[PDB]
Amino acid sequence: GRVRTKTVKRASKALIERYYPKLTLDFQTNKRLCDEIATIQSKRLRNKIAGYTTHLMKRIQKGPVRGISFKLQEEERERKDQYVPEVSARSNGVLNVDNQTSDLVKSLGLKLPLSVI
Amino acid sequence: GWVPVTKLGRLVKAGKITTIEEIFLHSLPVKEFQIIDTLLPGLQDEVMNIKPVQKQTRAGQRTRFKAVVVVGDSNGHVGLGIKTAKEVAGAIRAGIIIAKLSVIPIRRGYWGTNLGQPHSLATKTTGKCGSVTVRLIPAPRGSGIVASPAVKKLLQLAGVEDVYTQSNGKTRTLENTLKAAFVAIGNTYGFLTPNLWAEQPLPVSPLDIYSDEASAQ
Amino acid sequence: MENDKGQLVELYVPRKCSATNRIIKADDHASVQINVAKVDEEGRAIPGEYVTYALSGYVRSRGESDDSLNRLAQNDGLLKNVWSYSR
Amino acid sequence: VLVQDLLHPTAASEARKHKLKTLVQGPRSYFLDVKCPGCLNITTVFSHAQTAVTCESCSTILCTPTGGKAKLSEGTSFRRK
Amino acid sequence: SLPATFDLTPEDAQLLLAANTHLGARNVQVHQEPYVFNARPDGVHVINVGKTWEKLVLAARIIAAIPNPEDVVAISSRTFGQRAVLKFAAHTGATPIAGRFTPGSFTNYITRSFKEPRLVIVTDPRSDAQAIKEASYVNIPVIALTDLDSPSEFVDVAIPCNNRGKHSIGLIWYLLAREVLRLRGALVDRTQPWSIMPDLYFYRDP
Amino acid sequence: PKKRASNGRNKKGRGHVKPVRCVNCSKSIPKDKAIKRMAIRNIVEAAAVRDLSEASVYPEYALPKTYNKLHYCVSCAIHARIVRVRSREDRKNRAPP
Amino acid sequence: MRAKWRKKRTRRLKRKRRKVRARSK
Amino acid sequence: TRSSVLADALNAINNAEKTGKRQVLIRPSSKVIIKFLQVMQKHGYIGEFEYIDDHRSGKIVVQLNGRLNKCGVISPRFNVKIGDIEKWTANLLPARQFGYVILTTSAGIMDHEEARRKHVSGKILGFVY
Amino acid sequence: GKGKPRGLNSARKLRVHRRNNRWAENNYKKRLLGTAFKSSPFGGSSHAKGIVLEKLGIESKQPNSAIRKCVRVQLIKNGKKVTAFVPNDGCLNFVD
RNA sequence: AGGGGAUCGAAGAUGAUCAGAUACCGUCGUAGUCUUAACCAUAAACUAUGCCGACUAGGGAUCGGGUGGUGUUUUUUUAAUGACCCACUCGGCACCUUACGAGAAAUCAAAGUCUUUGGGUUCUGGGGGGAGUAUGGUCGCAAGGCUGAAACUUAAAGGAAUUG
Ligand SMILES: [Mg+2]
Ligand SMILES: [Mg+2]
Ligand SMILES: [Mg+2]
Ligand SMILES: [Mg+2]
Ligand SMILES: [Mg+2]
Ligand SMILES: [Mg+2]
Ligand SMILES: [Mg+2]
Ligand SMILES: [Mg+2]
Ligand SMILES: [Mg+2]
Ligand SMILES: [Mg+2]
Ligand SMILES: [Mg+2]
Ligand SMILES: [Mg+2]
Ligand SMILES: [Mg+2]
Ligand SMILES: [Mg+2]
Ligand SMILES: [Mg+2]
Ligand SMILES: [Mg+2]
Ligand SMILES: [Mg+2]
Ligand SMILES: [Mg+2]
Ligand SMILES: [Mg+2]
Ligand SMILES: [Mg+2]
Ligand SMILES: [Zn+2]
Ligand SMILES: [Zn+2]
Structure with a gap:
């Protein structure tokens, strides 16, 4: 069956790591990119490579790849991860504690908003 | 050119640490074999043994050599290395490197009268490496190292001058015999004689002091 | 370790653990x-200057490295009401 | 653990130990003064009495014995000392 | 030693009770017992939050002192504190480790991940034990977020938590960052809280 | 060297237990040993409940079950693969499959 | 041979010898 | 049945030291124990120790200060002639420069250094280093 | 502990018990039982001379193969017949 | 020895199988298998691990006992009482994890507190064979048990683990 070897996949993470935004989703343009940015000893290997690299591209778009990150995705992750809400804790109705934990509050030097369970 | 990959080698290559005891003092784990190479030239290495052992292919046989190496100045610093190689003088080299990595501080002492610089040992100490167990006893001046040639040579390079020994177990398994004579003369600095009862402040550690001159870009 | 004429022989004097007074081996x-x-006048952590304990391998391996360490802080002031002798 | 006030154990832990295993061994048992709501006789007993104790007369019964703490018979009073 | 400033202030304990760090492990362990304040009926174990805070500040004290900011490796592999050890790492230098710890980290220098930190801060001693274990191969201290049933072996200063999720790991990590910023650096006049949100250390899916 | 700290099965604290007969090859093994299995089934079997439920009188009728505790020598339990040679560490696992 | 069949063999030997000796009071 | 009492004492101490503790419990409390504990404190191998009055034979809480390697007993309490102390110290002491072999002489219980001075001897109790 | 009595008054046991145990030591028992004087072909003496009865060509053990030249001698002092090896090339022709 | 003698079943007999098949499998079946009154004194009679004492570590079950719980559940009304639940605690059958420690390793909470060698104590071993033989004694109706050599012979026999 058609299971791509490591020499192929290795060089797929390689091109994606580096030249990500220069890459595409279409076989034919990448297939040409591989000739500029990289040296590959035979067209079929080059094609095999270029073909897996693009398969990856087509699925990196629909969510990140389990072991692959690059510049523009790292930026993408920083932003979207820095979401801050309207706070939560806050408090929306005092502090809801049971007892003993109250005894912990009292036996400490603290007033706080009351509640017993 | 030595290009240190660890924080420690950096602070060594810089002349920022001048003594090995500095490393011991802080129990800093040494990893680059050049650290000791610089911290301690004039460190002779001795070839103990090179007996071949054998295994199998997915069928038959396996030839490979087992080199045993002792490194030591002759002054409180000794190492022990054991390596196997596909080659001969390959393991030998590799062993030495592995030996220096093991270089340990020796607490020589006085048999009695503290006249004119230590000769024997602090105390009776003993080590054990699976079955073989060696035990060294402080000795009068003129006694000398009373041990089986191998163990003795390890003790010469160790910096010991006079000491009594007593073996136990299969002392014919040389590799095991030495590794315990090693464990033995390395356990000296572990023993709480009343001198060290004295209170100390504990130094700051060259890893925090020269911390700037330590880390990478 | 002294000698003949009091001169300080013996290569090096090892740290002693601060929870068991036990020598810290060069390979420990x-x-x-x-x-x-x-910390100086409120908040600001004084650089260069530390309060420093040393905890030996054996204490740490047996998991005593927190309770013991805690007693040590509370008794150099660094803690209030956390450690408690009588238990 | 590792360092502790052996000479001064807590109380709530000293009361959790076995009778013999405290700092100095001591009995967990007491004595009750027991009478019945009819008579006026101050008959003092032991927490783990092994005998069917009665009031001096009246053929009454103060407690029945067991595998431990005695069983004060039905309606009866008791102060502990 | 430490001024009345450094004392509790019910602002924090407000957060700590609300972030529910005070709720702890049903079955404890023998080393965490001083931290235990009391046991609720129906098997619960109330941590003494003041203890937590006292140790937490102590953690900061040590996170500081150590010279360079970045060789203070802060570790997680637990989801619930991966963003947290990132956000902390954002503020104080402190090179972060979220996800796979990769054995051969502190030992083994040939690796493409050879950290040589001067201090380690962990979130769960259990699920990160391989980091804990490895630290002890190479003299590196360990700050750690224990609960009541946590493998206290090969840690050092330990801050009690809930680490059963939510805000309990977020807050402690957040709070740590606050006092490492307070002490030295830039936050100052510790009386007033922080512009920086507390829900910044939390976990999402979404 | 010893292979199980269970030695053979589980006694520990007795010394002797009555022996049972192997259900299969009629051996004799101590009940404390003996690979034991229950064998509860339906008399009518799978395929046949159809004709059975059909051909009967009675409102649907409650199916009887047949019950049988089974006992096997190590020899016969192993061969009929009721139990299998597990790994050095696998052997430890007392867990039911 | 098996330890116990060895044991058997020698319990037989003894009887044989015991009876050959017997042959003189 | 208990046999030496000064055995189980020294052992507890020895045991408690090894495991990192800085306090022990010693039941029961013989005078021989205390005098030993005294000799063992005179050179600070232990710290403060406090008798506990059960209405019985006693307990003791000894405070440990590290630096103890082994406090041993020797049983049976052999007969040591004066020039045989030289021999025991040879055998069961770490170095010529320290350590102790405490005895029982008619002149009370004492470390071997002391007996060496007062010129006395008797049985052997054990050793400390 | 140890499995040997340690009493200050136990010498008898420790004494007889080793005396009892020296017997498993071969060299000791040979000496005590005077095997030397009894079963040994010499008296115990380091040498003996006897008269050569016949020449023998005992073949070697495995994995060797040769004809070791020996002689059946009859010892003068006690008439015992034992055989002895005759060392070195063709020395067997020196004895008759 | 008496009783008993269903079952299974040494010996034996048979049918198969095999080159042979005194076997394994199948069939018949003696003694035996049970009991009483006498013997016997041995088993891998095993945990292949003496007993009493002390000490060193973490966890969950479970058996017996006891204590504490304005806990649950049981009635005709919710008391006693029974079972059950939680914590504790002795004393058990064990299990789990650990590994400071021990070991040749397998592994071991003892097989640890042992060259930093001593709590008290009973027994046994001292290369492999010859050999549990010979001999003597003793007990036994007997089978046998207990006690138990040497001449000679021999360079290994043996353990644990590893890779084939
Ligand atoms: Mg041995
Ligand atoms: Mg087998
Ligand atoms: Mg069984
Ligand atoms: Mg049995
Ligand atoms: Mg047999
Ligand atoms: Mg027989
Ligand atoms: Mg027969
Ligand atoms: Mg002839
Ligand atoms: Mg037949
Ligand atoms: Mg016929
Ligand atoms: Mg036949
Ligand atoms: Mg027997
Ligand atoms: Mg015991
Ligand atoms: Mg336990
Ligand atoms: Mg009670
Ligand atoms: Mg039981
Ligand atoms: Mg292990
Ligand atoms: Mg040969
Ligand atoms: Mg084998
Ligand atoms: Mg194999
Ligand atoms: Zn009354
Ligand atoms: Zn079967």
Whole structure:
């Protein structure tokens, strides 16, 4: 069956790591990119490579790849991860504690908003 | 050119640490074999043994050599290395490197009268490496190292001058015999004689002091 | 270690653990050295200057490295009401 | 653990130990003064009495014995000392 | 030693009770017992939050002192504190480790991940034990977020938590960052809280 | 060297237990040993409940079950693969499959 | 041979010898 | 049945030291124990120790200060002639420069250094280093 | 502990018990039982001379193969017949 | 020895199988298998691990006992009482994890507190064979048990683990 070897996949993470935004989703343009940015000893290997690299591209778009990150995705992750809400804790109705934990509050030097369970 | 990959080698290559005891003092784990190479030239290495052992292919046989190496100045610093190689003088080299990595501080002492610089040992100490167990006893001046040639040579390079020994177990398994004579003369600095009862402040550690001159870009 | 004429022989004098007074071996690579910051007039941690304990491998391996360490802080002031002798 | 006030154990833990295993061994048992709501006789007993104790007369019964703490018979009073 | 400033202030304990760090492990362990304040009926174990805070500040004290900011490796592999050890790492230098710890980290220098930190801060001693274990091969101290049933072996200063999720790991990590910023650096006049949100250390899916 | 700290099965604290007969090859093994299995089934079997439920009188009728505790020598339990040679560490696992 | 069949063999030997000896009071 | 009492004492101490503790419990409390504990404190191998009055034979809490390697008993309490102390110290002491072999002489219980001075001897109790 | 009595008054046991145990030591028992004087072909003496009865060509053990030249001698002092090896090339032709 | 003698079943007999098949499998079946009154004194009679004492570590079950719980559940009304639940605690059958420690390793909470060698104490071993033989004694109706050599012979026999 058609299971791509490591020499192929290795060089797929390689091109994606580096030249990500220069890459595409279409076989034919990448297939040409591989000739500029990289040296590959035979067209079929080059094609095999270029073909897996693009398969990856087509699925990196629909969510990140389990072991692959690059510049523009790292930026993408920083932003979207820095979401801050309207706070939560806050408090929306005092502090809801049971007892003993109250005894912990009292036996400490603290007033706080009351509640017993 | 030595290009240190660890924080420690950096602070060594810089002349920022001048003594090995500095490393011991802080129990800093040494990893680059050049650290000791610089911290301690004039460190002779001795070839103990090179007996071949054998295994199998997915069928038959396996030839490979087992080199045993002792490194030591002759002054409180000794190492022990054991390596196997596909080659001969390959393991030998590799062993030495592995030996220096093991270089340990020796607490020589006085048999009695503290006249004119230590000769024997602090105390009776003993080590054990699976079955073989060696035990060294402080000795009068003129006694000398009373041990089986191998163990003795390890003790010469160790910096010991006079000491009594007593073996136990299969002392014919040389590799095991030495590794315990090693464990033995390395356990000296572990023993709480009343001198060290004295209170100390504990130094700051060259890893925090020269911390700037330590880390990478 | 002295000698004939009192001169300080013996290559090096080893640290002693601060929870068991037990010598820190040159190969005791689970032996740890904590460095805690002294704080000047409110807030600002004084750089360069530490309150420092040393905890040996054996204490740490047996998991005593927190309780023991805690007693040590509370008794150099660094803690209030956490450790408690009588238990 | 590792360092502790052996000479001064807590109380709530000293009361959790076995009778013989405290700092100095001591009995967990007491004595009750027991009478019945009819008579006026101050008959003092032991927490783990092994005998069917009665009031001086009246053929009454103060407690029945067991595998431990005695069983004060039905309606009866008791102060502990 | 430490001024009345450094004392509790019910602002924090407000957060700590609300972030529910005070709720702890049903079955404890023998080393965490001083931290235990009391046991609720129906098997619960109330941590003494003041203890937590006292140790937490102590952690900061040590996170500081150590010179260079970045060789203070802060570790997680637990989801619930991966963003947290990132956000902390954002503020104080402190090179972060979220996800796979990769054995051969502190030992083994040939690796493409050879950290040589001067201090380690962990979130769960259990699920990160391989980091804990490895630290002890190479003299590195360990700050750690224990609960009541946590493998206290090969840690050092330990801050009690809930680490059963939510805000309990977020807050402690957040709070740590606050006092490492307070002490030295830039936050100052510790009386007033922080512009920086507390829900910044939390976990999402979404 | 010893292979199980269970030695053979589980006694520990007795010394002797009555022996049972192997259900299969009629051996004799101590009940404390003996690979034991229950064998509860339906008399009518799978395929046949159809004709059975059909051909009967009675409102649907409650199916009887047949019950049988089974006992096997190590020899016969192994061969009929009721139990299998597990790994050095696998052997430890007392867990039911 | 098996330890116990060895044991058997020698319990037989003894009887044989015991009876050959017997042959003189 | 208990046999030496000064055995189980020294052992507890020895045991408690090894496991990192800085306090022990010693039941029961013989005078021989205390005098030993005294000799063992005179050179600070232990710290403060406090008798506990059960209405019985006693307990003791000894405070440990590290630096103890082994406090041993020797049983049976052999007969040591004066020039045989030289021999025991040879055998069961770490170095010529320290350590102790405490005895029982008619001149009370004492470390071997002391007996060496007062010129006395008797049985052997054990050793400390 | 140890499995040997340690009493200050136990010498008898420790004494007889080893005396009892020296017997498993071969060299000791040979000496005590005077095997030397009894079963040994010499008296115990380091040498003996006897008269050569016949020449023998005993073949070697495995894995060797040769004809070791020996002689059946009859010892003068006690008439015992034992055989002895005759060392070195063709020395067997020196004895008759 | 008496009783008993269903079952299974040494010996034996048979049918198969095999080159042979005194076997394994199948069939018949003696003694035996049970009991009483006498013997016997041995088993891998095993945990292949003496007993009493002390000490060193973490966890969950479970058996017996006891204590504490304005806990649950049981009635005709919610008391006693029974079972059950939680914590504790002795004393058990064990299990789990650990590994400071021990070991040749397998592994071991003892097989640890042992060259930093001593709590008290009973027994046994001292290369492999010859050999549990010979001999003597003793007990036994007997089978046998207990006690138990040497001449000679021999360079290994043996353990644990590893890779084939
Ligand atoms: Mg041995
Ligand atoms: Mg087998
Ligand atoms: Mg069984
Ligand atoms: Mg049995
Ligand atoms: Mg047999
Ligand atoms: Mg027989
Ligand atoms: Mg027969
Ligand atoms: Mg002839
Ligand atoms: Mg037949
Ligand atoms: Mg016929
Ligand atoms: Mg036949
Ligand atoms: Mg027997
Ligand atoms: Mg015991
Ligand atoms: Mg336990
Ligand atoms: Mg009670
Ligand atoms: Mg039981
Ligand atoms: Mg292990
Ligand atoms: Mg040969
Ligand atoms: Mg084998
Ligand atoms: Mg194999
Ligand atoms: Zn009354
Ligand atoms: Zn079967």
